[PDB]
Ligand binder design. Structure first.
Ligand SMILES: CC[C@](C)(CO)Nc1ncnc2[nH]ccc12
Ligand SMILES: [Cl-]
Length: 167
């Protein structure tokens, strides 16, 4: 039993809700919140910009030190950093950004990072300003993640389409 509330159950382990991931994380304070990251951990917009703003830029400061030490992430890769005031940990995961011409096949690799954590709050990878089909991102999530994932969808219209088209 966990403290996530109001989710629709899609499969044994995948759940989905119309919610603002920022407001969800503050309420639940999950062990792991997923960020929709880029390889440079520059959290300028989309989910990343919103999560970083909620940390008063502390996420960005920590991220800049991480990049200075380690260099950029790989597309499809991840790193674990602090969750600041939002969660214990933030799993920064880089899905392909279609608006950069990145291979959509790397979306499965991106979701594989979730399997290293028993329970996660997350957005749909490569959705939003990363320019992938969110229905596809859900299909890949369900077919790749085996741990317990609570998916937050900001747009209510998109949330309803995700549910009604789900196979
Ligand atoms: C619309 C769905 C998605 C593309 C990925 O799930 N964007 C978000 N999901 C959840 N919370 C969010 N806050 C800001 C953006 C955002
Ligand atoms: Cl977005």
């Amino acid at each position: 039993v966990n403290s996530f509330s109001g989710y629709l159950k899609l499969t044994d382990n995948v759940y989905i809700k119309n919610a603002d991931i920022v407001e969800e994380a503050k309420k639940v304070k999950p062990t792991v919140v997923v960020n929709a990251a880029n390889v440079y951990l520059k959290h300028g917009g989309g989910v990343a910009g919103a999560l970083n703003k909620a940390t008063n830029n502390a996420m960005q400061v920590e991220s800049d030190d991480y990049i200075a030490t380690n260099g950029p992430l790989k597309v499809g890769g991840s790193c674990v950093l602090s969750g600041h005031n939002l969660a214990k940990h933030c799993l920064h995961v880089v899905g392909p950004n279609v608006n950069k011409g990145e291979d959509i096949q790397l979306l499965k690799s991106a979701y594989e990072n979730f399997n290293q954590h028993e329970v996660l709050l997350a957005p749909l990878l490569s959705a939003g300003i990363f320019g992938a089909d969110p229905i596809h991102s859900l299909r890949v999530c369900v077919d790749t993640v085996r741990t317990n994932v609570y998916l937050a969808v900001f747009d209510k219209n998109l949330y309803d389409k995700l549910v009604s088209s789900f196979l």
